[PDB]
Amino acid sequence: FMVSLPRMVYPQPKVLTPCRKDVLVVTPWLAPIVWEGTFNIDILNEQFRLQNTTIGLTVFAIKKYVAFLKLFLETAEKHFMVGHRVHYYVFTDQPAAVPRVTLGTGRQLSVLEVGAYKRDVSMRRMEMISDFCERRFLSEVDYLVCVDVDMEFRDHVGVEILTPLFGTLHPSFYGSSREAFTYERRPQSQAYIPKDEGDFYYMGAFFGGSVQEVQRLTRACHQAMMVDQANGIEAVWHDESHLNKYLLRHKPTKVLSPEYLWDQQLLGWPAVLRKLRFTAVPKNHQAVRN
Amino acid sequence: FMVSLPRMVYPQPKVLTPCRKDVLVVTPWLAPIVWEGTFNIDILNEQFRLQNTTIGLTVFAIKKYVAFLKLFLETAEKHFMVGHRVHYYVFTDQPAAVPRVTLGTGRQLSVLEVGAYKRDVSMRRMEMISDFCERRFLSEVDYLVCVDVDMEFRDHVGVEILTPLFGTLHPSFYGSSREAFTYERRPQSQAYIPKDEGDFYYMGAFFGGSVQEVQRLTRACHQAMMVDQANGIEAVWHDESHLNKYLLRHKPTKVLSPEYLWDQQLLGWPAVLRKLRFTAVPKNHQAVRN
Ligand SMILES: CCCCCCO[C@@H]1O[C@H](CO)[C@H](O)[C@H](O)[C@H]1O[C@@H]1O[C@@H](C)[C@@H](O)[C@@H](O)[C@@H]1O
Numbered sequence: 001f002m003v004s005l006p007r008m009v010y011p012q013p014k015v016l017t018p019c020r021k022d023v024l025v026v027t028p029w030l031a032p033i034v035w036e037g038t039f040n041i042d043i044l045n046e047q048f049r050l051q052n053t054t055i056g057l058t059v060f061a062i063k064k065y066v067a068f069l070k071l072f073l074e075t076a077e078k079h080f081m082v083g084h085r086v087h088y089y090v091f092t093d094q095p096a097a098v099p100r101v102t103l104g105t106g107r108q109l110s111v112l113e114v115g116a117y118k119r120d121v122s123m124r125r126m127e128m129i130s131d132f133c134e135r136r137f138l139s140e141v142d143y144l145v146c147v148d149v150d151m152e153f154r155d156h157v158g159v160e161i162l163t164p165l166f167g168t169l170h171p172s173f174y175g176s177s178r179e180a181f182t183y184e185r186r187p188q189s190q191a192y193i194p195k196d197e198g199d200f201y202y203m204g205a206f207f208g209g210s211v212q213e214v215q216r217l218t219r220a221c222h223q224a225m226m227v228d229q230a231n232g233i234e235a236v237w238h239d240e241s242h243l244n245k246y247l248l249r250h251k252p253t254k255v256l257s258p259e260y261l262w263d264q265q266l267l268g269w270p271a272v273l274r275k276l277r278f279t280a281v282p283k284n285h286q287a288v289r290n
Numbered sequence: 291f292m293v294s295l296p297r298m299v300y301p302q303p304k305v306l307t308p309c310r311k312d313v314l315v316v317t318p319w320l321a322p323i324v325w326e327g328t329f330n331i332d333i334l335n336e337q338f339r340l341q342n343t344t345i346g347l348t349v350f351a352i353k354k355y356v357a358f359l360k361l362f363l364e365t366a367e368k369h370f371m372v373g374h375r376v377h378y379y380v381f382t383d384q385p386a387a388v389p390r391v392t393l394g395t396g397r398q399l400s401v402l403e404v405g406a407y408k409r410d411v412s413m414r415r416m417e418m419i420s421d422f423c424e425r426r427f428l429s430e431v432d433y434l435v436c437v438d439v440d441m442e443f444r445d446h447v448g449v450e451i452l453t454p455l456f457g458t459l460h461p462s463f464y465g466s467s468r469e470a471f472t473y474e475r476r477p478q479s480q481a482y483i484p485k486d487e488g489d490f491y492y493m494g495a496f497f498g499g500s501v502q503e504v505q506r507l508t509r510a511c512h513q514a515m516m517v518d519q520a521n522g523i524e525a526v527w528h529d530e531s532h533l534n535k536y537l538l539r540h541k542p543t544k545v546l547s548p549e550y551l552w553d554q555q556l557l558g559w560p561a562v563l564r565k566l567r568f569t570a571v572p573k574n575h576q577a578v579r580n
């Protein structure tokens with residue numbers, strides 16, 4: 001049951017005025033595409049606080065990637081769901097290397113120890129989120145957000161993203177035609193998508209939804225990755241290829257604009273982006289991965 | 291559980307191309323506003339058919355308004371949820387005056403006899419939908435759509451409207467500023483809305499949602515109307531005033547554009563409307579109401 005909103009004073013939405021005319025703000029299956037100027041965060045904060053919403057955030061920091069946790073967490077404290085209940089779940093092979101980060105009220109952090117894989121693994125993250133943590137998340141949070149650690153928050157990332165299932169537009173492909181998307185193209189893979197199919201290219205570094213929908217997605221992707229492994233094939237972009245297949249066949253109920261996953265070093269700051277919210281931290285891929 | 295969509299071939303949505311730049315297509319609380327060009331009906335039909343969705347439609351035809359049923363139902367057969375399961379519920383004081391209309395497969399009609407009120411009643415429709423039919427609807431349909439009878443369908447009205455809770459933009463006020471909206475303005479009424487509040491002016495002739503959400507809305511409006519009656523006040527636009535108060539405090543999850551509730555005699559055919567879907571049948575208000 002959703003209680004009534006209180007009286008609020010805010011600008012009237014005008015039907016004959018879009019704010020955003022430069023971008024698509026709704027998908028053809030009537031899912032909002034979240035850009036700055038499309039939402040009144042005061043209304044959304046009211047709606048979600050009235051439900052006492054708890055957001056879980058999963059992040060993996062394996063081997064050298066533990067070095068990214070301090071900036072990741074400290075900037076999450078500044079920008080991620082501030083005012084709402086947040087539970088961070090940090091998956092690591094080195095619990096003692098997790099930095100002691102000071103949290104705001106109503107926010108908690110759990111360190112979950114896992115095994116480290118040598119490779120660019122596809123399988124652990126989808127498996128961990130589904131198979132091992134299923135019961136935990138259902139009991140503790142309403143929504144799950146699953147992100148990469150080699151990132152920092154620079155601006156607001158809030159309840160505007162919350163919905164049963166969301167993906168995020170990959171910053172390198174939002175202007176690309178579907179034939180150019182780097183989907184898995186081999187029919188022998190479970191992640192296969194033909195050249196005439198596809199809505200968007202979603203980045204594997206930021207997806208989420210309700211606990212139920214995220215467990216469905218991660219279970220499906222893990223199962224599909226196991227099939228590929230049994231067949232001696234590894235999708236071109238690993239779990240991201242499978243995420244893309246899933247979200248093609250199970251449409252997300254919101255899509256996040258590239259505001260929510262940006263690399264400024266690589267791509268600059270285009271006019272279409274009014275805010276850069278969650279951004280890549282420069283890294284040496286080869287050095288840091290081995 | 292939502293099964294996978296099949297392979298489909300359709301035009302790729304392009305992020306840097308809106309189709310609609312002339313109108314607001316999403317509310318500030320991230321609810322789609324449904325206009326032609328914003329949805330791919332093939333994708334939506336797939337989604338809703340895979341859930342075997344059943345839509346109930348309620349319509350009241352009391353006293354002289356039974357004369358409107360033939361055109362209403364015959365045009366509903368042509369345009370309303372074609373291909374989906376539909377259950378019409380016709381509430382009338384004259385069961386024998388309900389026309390025998392031929393229905394397509396998967397569609398059924400129930401005649402529900404009620405008492406006729408003399409007045410421009412506010413109370414029967416909200417009361418009937420909540421208090422008397424609660425159990426029936428929960429067992430028989432997934433969504434309820436509640437409309438006026440003095441109407442005809444001229445174009446597609448389909449699953450694009452379906453959502454937990456929707457209202458429809460009143461065709462006379464979609465371009466108006468909120469101070470001009472004919473909300474109830476007396477603080478002594480439960481429907482009161484101050485001049486600095488309001489998103490939209492919703493028409494009482496077309497609202498709906500899931501059964502649960504429609505029973506919540508109709509219950510709340512009926513209760514509020516009973517309070518006003520006990521206090522010797524009747525809202526300026528009767529159940530529409532209360533509907534507007536409810537949807538201010540409980541934001542709808544989609545909003546239908548005036549495509550879905552139009553009067554061509556009164557308002558013509560503006561450029562902003564690409565389709566006229568559900569339209570007023572000319573009537574002599576005084577003659578037909580007494
Ligand atoms: C010099 C690197 C050029 C990379 C451009 C394209 O992006 C890559 O797209 C791939 C799919 O085709 C995968 O999503 C990679 O994760 C992504 O690279 C990741 O995300 C990017 C946004 C960058 O942050 C990159 O450093 C990172 O490895």
Ligand SMILES: CCCCCCO[C@@H]1O[C@H](CO)[C@H](O)[C@H](O)[C@H]1O[C@@H]1O[C@@H](C)[C@@H](O)[C@@H](O)[C@@H]1O
Nearest residue numbers: 460461462472493494527530552553556570575
């Ligand atoms: C010559 C009549 C001028 C009416 C213009 C405004 O509309 C009225 O707006 C009211 C709220 O302020 C209520 O919603 C009425 O139901 C509506 O009239 C109804 O809907 C309209 C769209 C018309 O179809 C009208 O005939 C009908 O009575």
Ligand SMILES: O=c1ccn([C@@H]2O[C@H](COP(=O)(O)OP(=O)(O)O)[C@@H](O)[C@H]2O)c(=O)[nH]1
Nearest residue numbers: 059060061062063064065120148149150289
């Ligand atoms: O040695 C590693 C490699 C990867 N990761 C995790 O897997 C994510 C995806 O890898 P990466 O960020 O290197 O991929 P990219 O964004 O460069 O494609 C990282 O953010 C980490 O959360 C990790 O913890 N340790």
Ligand SMILES: O=c1ccn([C@@H]2O[C@H](COP(=O)(O)OP(=O)(O)O)[C@@H](O)[C@H]2O)c(=O)[nH]1
Nearest residue numbers: 349350351352353354355410438439440579
């Ligand atoms: O004598 C009446 C008066 C009203 N109605 C029902 O109440 C609705 C609302 O009344 P009306 O359409 O006259 O209001 P308007 O759209 O003109 O404001 C009608 O469509 C009918 O469904 C009815 O059945 N009999």
Ligand SMILES: [Mn+2]
Nearest residue numbers: 148149150205
């Ligand atoms: Mn990364």
Ligand SMILES: [Mn+2]
Nearest residue numbers: 438439440495
């Ligand atoms: Mn009417």
